[PDB]
């Protein structure tokens, strides 16, 4: 028993992280097959980032202007191209440590593990969620750009995030592995506004089911509610609206615990109106929304990877 | 910027996890060089665990009674021995993926990463602390026994924990890699009492320094205090006493932020007497004690590994 903010094993990703250096800037890159993916602002100086013309800046660069290192072995760049906001550096050697992988664009509310790297070397791994406003509350220092987010399905590694920048508000923004930003952000050092950040209601409900499974049950109460009645209360407290697709995803958890989804919503409704009263749920004094229904099932059953 | 409960990259440990099977019981083992370490109760049935005579139970077993698997390759057991509560299975093949490693016995308050495994396959990684009562609040299901805890110093892997059992209270207990239990626990299914769990004050202070570094400063107040004055307040709220060695460890953080250790203690004193008043520090409504002073420095500077 017990419940922890668990991240995927990062072994398969550590073997794909390399150090990419262009001119004076150095950041991390993802080496899969004979292609190295990295943020395109590696071709920028600190001055260029204020208002960069990436096309004009890439004209000045040649294949030999890029230094790709994997630990202590060098990689020769044979070709280069810009796909949206990522750079694709074609190298001569195919990464022998390439695992089975896909490129996936996740939706808000979904969770993934981040492997923070600096100078192509892994430093730590943690779990986080894609906020409804397409930002993540990560932990990134200068030089962490190019760090990737990923999920693991048995033997396949689904890459879903590449870190590109920290916003002036302290939150973080990035792209998928095709170079398309999550949200309305651009790879430029300017004041960019992130929308209102809302709580992922479906994740909170899944978290409450994990609490019941692990012995926390004080929040279970006497009432029930309707979808519209709850969504009305939820919107006042900046909670995502609950749809029928969310009820369907929680089905397996409802069957395990014998608590109807709508009954759990009534419990959450009271928690929203009356607070926690100094109590804790799974050791947390706040309502957690970084566990998806699949994460809860995964951790409460023991799904593994190879 | 930002601050996350970060775990070490588990790549170097995933290559050492194997599946150990004796008779009918199967759990995880740590394969280093030509020795496989695993909990000794792998030789026990569900009936034996109530009151096991491990010596008499090991007499009945021979080298061929142990099935060691690494993914899909078999390992032939050449020798076996019992060191305290761990079993050391000498095999014919030396693990090629053996990293530089030490065996370390940590002290309470220190943190480490846990790689939860089932049937020798990694499933997740999370960070936790050794409670002052020599337990850990982990996430372990049946078959997770043998999962190891570890730290990483650049290129060396320090193994410090092997999971052995879950106590009736839901908390978890284990040994070092020499088989010595942390705490007064024995590898037997009986009612075992864990001491009073206290908060790791030095870790809370380090966490507060991380908050100041990341922009959270409302808890900084006007007062100061003495070591004895604070320790008096701390003991009432079940906080570990603060010694001069703790003040010395926090020195670098005090120099970075310009806030004297004793001044930070005064801030924590008020938080203990008046609570948080519905506010949050680094997104947490409770006082976090699972970050050591070294963890904070590590995450706020960007120390990496290879
Ligand atoms: Zn950058
Ligand atoms: Zn066991």
CA proximity to A218, closest of A266, A286, A279, A259: A279
Out of B1, B166, B304, name the one closest to residue A121 (CB). Answer: B304
- For B89, counting Cβ atoms within 10 Å of its Cβ (0-12 exposed, 13-18 middle, 19+ buried), the class is buried
Q: Other CB atoms closer than 10 Å to residue A277's CB: what's the count? A: 7
Method: X-ray
| CA of B143 relative to ligand 2 center, distance in Å | 7
Active site residue ranges of A: 41, 145
Mutate to test the interface with A, among B1, B17, B124, B279 (most CBs of A within 10 A): B124
Residue B41: active-site member = yes
* Residue A126 C-alpha, separation from nearest chain B C-alpha, in angstroms: 5
Domains A11-90 and A201-300 share a fold: no
Q: Do residue B139 and residue A6 have CB atoms under 8 angstroms apart?
A: yes
Out of B11, B126, B301, name the one closest to residue A10 (CB). Answer: B11
Q: Between vectors from CA B95 to CA B90 and to CA B99, what angle results, nearest 5°?
A: 120
Please list the residues that pair with A88 across neighbouring strands.
A37, A81
Which of B16, B41, B128, B163 is the catalytic position? B41
DSSP string of chain A, one letter each residue:
------B---HHHHTTEEEEEETTEEEEEEEETTEEEEEGGGG--TTGGGS--HHHHHHT--GGGEEEEETTEEE-EEEEEEETTEEEEEESS--TTPPSEEE----TT-EEEEEEEETTEEEEEEEEE--TTS-B-----TT-TT-EEEEEETTEEEEEEEEEEE-TTS-EEEE-TTSPBSSS--SSSS--------B-HHHHHHHHHHHHHTT--TT--S----HHHHHHHHHHTTBPPP-HHHHHHTHHHHHHHT--HHHHHHHHHHHHHH--TT--BTTBSS---S--HHHHHHHTTT----
Which residues keep their CB under 5 angstroms from ion ligand 1? A 145
Q: A141 — contact with chain B (CB < 8 Å)? A: yes
Ligand nearest to the CA of B48: 2
| CA of B200 relative to ligand 1 center, distance in Å | 36
Residue A18 to residue B7: CA distance in whole angstroms: 20
Which residues keep their CB under 5 angstroms from ion ligand 2? B 145
| CA of A119 relative to ligand 1 center, distance in Å | 12
Chain A to chain B Cβ contacts (< 8 Å): 152
* A-proximal residues of B, 188-207, CB under 8 Å: none
DSSP string of B182-225, one letter each residue:
SSS--SSSS--------B-HHHHHHHHHHHHHTT--TT--S---
Residue B201 to residue B199: CA distance in whole angstroms: 6
Q: Do residue B10 and residue A10 have CB atoms under 8 angstroms apart?
A: yes
* Residue A143 C-alpha, separation from nearest chain B C-alpha, in angstroms: 9
Which residues, other chains included, contact A259 with Cβ-Cβ below 8 Å and sequence gap of 6+? A209, A212, A220
Q: What fold characterizes domain B201-300?
A: main proteinase (3clpro) structure, domain 3 (1.10.1840)
Q: B299 — contact with chain A (CB < 8 Å)? A: yes
Nearest CA in chain A to B153: A123
Nearest CA in chain A to B13: A11
Q: What are phi and psi of B98, to 5 degrees?
A: -70, 115
Q: What fold characterizes domain B11-90?
A: Thrombin, subunit H (2.40.10)
Resolution (A): 2.2
Q: Do residue A121 and residue B305 have CB atoms under 8 angstroms apart?
A: yes
| CA of B147 relative to ligand 2 center, distance in Å | 10
């Amino acid at each position: 028993s017990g419940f922890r903010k668990m991240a995927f094993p990062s072994g398969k990703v550590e073997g794909c992280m390399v150090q990419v250096t262009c001119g004076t800037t150095t950041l991390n890159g993802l080496w899969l097959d004979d292609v190295v993916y990295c943020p395109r602002h590696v071709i920028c100086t600190s001055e260029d980032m204020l208002n960069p013309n990436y096309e004009d800046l890439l004209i000045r660069k040649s294949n030999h202007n890029f230094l790709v290192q994997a630990g202590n072995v060098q990689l020769r760049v044979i070709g280069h191209s810009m796909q949206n906001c990522v750079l694709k550096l074609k190298v001569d050697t195919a990464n022998p440590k390439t695992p089975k992988y896909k490129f996936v664009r996740i939706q808000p509310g979904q969770t993934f593990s981040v492997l923070a790297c600096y100078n192509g070397s892994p430093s730590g791994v943690y779990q986080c969620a894609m906020r409804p406003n397409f930002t993540i509350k990560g932990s990134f220092l200068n030089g962490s750009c190019g760090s990737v987010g990923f999920n693991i399905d048995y033997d396949c590694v689904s890459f879903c995030y590449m870190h590109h920048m920290e916003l002036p508000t302290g939150v973080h923004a990035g792209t998928d592995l095709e170079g398309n930003f999550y949200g309305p952000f651009v790879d430029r050092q300017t004041a960019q506004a992130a929308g209102t950040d809302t709580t992922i209601t479906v994740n909170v409900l899944a978290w409450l089911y994990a609490a019941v499974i692990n012995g926390d049950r004080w929040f279970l109460n006497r009432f029930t509610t309707t979808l519209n009645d709850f969504n009305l209360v939820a919107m006042k407290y900046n909670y995502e609206p609950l749809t029928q697709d969310h009820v369907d995803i929680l089905g397996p958890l409802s069957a395990q615990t014998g608590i109807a989804v709508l009954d759990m919503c009534a419990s959450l409704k009271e928690l929203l109106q009356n607070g926690m009263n100094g109590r804790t749920i799974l050791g947390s004094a706040l309502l957690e929304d970084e566990f998806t229904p699949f994460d809860v099932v995964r951790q409460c059953s023991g799904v593994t990877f190879q």
